[PDB]
Amino acid sequence: EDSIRLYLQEIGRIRLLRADEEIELARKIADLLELERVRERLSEKLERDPRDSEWAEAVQLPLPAFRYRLHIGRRAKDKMVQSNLRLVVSIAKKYMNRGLSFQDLIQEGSLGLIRAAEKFDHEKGYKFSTYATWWIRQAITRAIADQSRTIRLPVHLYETISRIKKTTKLLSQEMGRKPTEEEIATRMEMTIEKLRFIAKSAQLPISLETPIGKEEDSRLGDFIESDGETPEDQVSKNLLREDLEKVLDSLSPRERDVLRLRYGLDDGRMKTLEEIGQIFNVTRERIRQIEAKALRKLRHPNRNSVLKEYIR
Amino acid sequence: TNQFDYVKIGLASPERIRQWGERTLPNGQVVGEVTKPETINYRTLKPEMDGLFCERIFGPAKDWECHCGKYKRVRHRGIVCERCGVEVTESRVRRHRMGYIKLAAPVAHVWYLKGIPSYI
Amino acid sequence: VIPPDLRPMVQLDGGRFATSDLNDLYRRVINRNNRLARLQEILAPEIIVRNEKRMLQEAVDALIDNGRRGRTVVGANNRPLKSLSDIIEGKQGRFRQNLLGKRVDYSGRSVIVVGPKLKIHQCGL
């Protein structure tokens, strides 16, 4: 169940090739490649895709021989991407320890492998070993940086951070332990504010349950609470409600309505005096008057002196 | 106590699984699915919009706050966000929504499989 | 997929964060999935795509139950992760400890001492 090996065996049992052998290819691959982008051209102009027949190419072809031509053309790439297999693992494995996962890598490469596998030109002669491996690398990096972190950060910043590390190490050389920061900013181009941000920004989270420590007795996170609140607060509040309620609800019961209408005591903050004026009985000159009236009424000692302690 | 009598153990057919996270909205177009494995954003901390913490399919972590914005109060409750399709409903609505992944390949449930009798 | 917060994940004071293996197993399988869809989309030659599925497969798997069959996943936790199964299993499966045994308040412990003068059916306090 090695998985890595379980695939590694088998790829073994596909065997490596040489430039010449991979040349018959190249042509064929191109022969298929371009052919399709016919298929796309004809797509884009029309019906969105030839994607019928021998007319699934605008080109001319005895139809059976088309699909055939296609087969050999792309079979080359298939019989090439896999044909390589190794070397990409020699590359990906370098990131099997960097992060992601040996298998995870392998794929990624693969992806690349493809792309290269076809964006690739036997006319410049020198082998894909000095080009395929390029695309690979690329692919990869864009994976442990695209994830393997469970909080995706600007893959660009990653470099900046590293670049800082190197540049700061240079400072450290002259100024040991690079105590310089804002002076490092003369070479860091930005206040330590972001430097420190970067520091935290480049933090990897913690299992929430690593067993605590100084004792294997328990995981972590088991000493905190959710976004919820203790009843102690809940209640106090709810007191407020009524406390109020009555205390308001002992002066002009009608007006008390607007007290809750143009304000809260329910679920509007609000009903803009405008709308409210008419809401209760259609009014313009009977609102902010009773409004202040209500407040100043329940205001002043004996009245406001009830929330004086329950200012919640 | 008087909410139910017996439980019904069983399995979740792909409809029932996909019936754990539909949260279809009034724009009329379904959701609950998550199109991203990553978590909260790096700059801010908000829950992407289709990752493991997408609000619009689990719920507005910020009580009545369309991830989009515009509304930050119970006042805006039943009403949701046009622009984000966040289902504005406090936050306790989360911890319960569920969502799900259409699978690009079937997987013989570990449980039925390497089980003592390997029922499969 | 679990309602998020139970796979909660959390800002920690020092700035660091409290990732949950749940979203982790998960997210994994996501990639693997997507990617795989892109593999059939790119119509990659099987044996990749094949391989692939294989993987997927067991990503899923582990999610359900780590360490069951293939190689126990071990992430930044520097140890086997915590699959869906096992958080509800063992001595500490949800059952047996938060559930038959929860951990209430309105309580108080202490050392103990003989309470002479104080009669029985009484206690110090």
Place this chain on the structure above:
Amino acid sequence: VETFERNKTIFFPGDPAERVYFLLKGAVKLSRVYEAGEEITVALLRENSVFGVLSLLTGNKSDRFYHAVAFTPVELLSAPIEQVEQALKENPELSMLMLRGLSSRILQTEMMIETLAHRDMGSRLVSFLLILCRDFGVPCADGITIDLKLSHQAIAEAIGSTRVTVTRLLGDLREKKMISIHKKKITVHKPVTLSR
């Protein structure tokens, strides 16, 4: 150097942080509260100067029994009660200082006295109008005006008014000759002269 905005209060009755303050700038008028309602300001100040005698009335157990006001954007300093307690306990001058400031708020009262509750709501409105021009006035060309951005009915607290501030004053603004307005301004033309 405590302070607030053009629409605020300094405090209420019942609220026991009653030590002599020090309005550093702005009026910060205090609106003495009432039962059902209607609050004079009475109090109204200057640079540096104090207000809110509290730990001083019924000893340090006095209840303001008078809500306060952050009238204009405030500016107000204060001092640990000791300053008017221990530090005051010392040489008279120390206490006298506070007493002199108290005498200011007192003078203020005398100023309202006679001018306020005079009889007519027009003469009275002017009885302290010129006074106002002598307090936060702004002299400019016409003469010693105020200029502060104001109601028609804060004004009414000047009388018990309803439209007099926007109607009668219009008289002085033009029909009668005494002030002018820039959206919400006051141009007292004069100390006496026309309109006297």
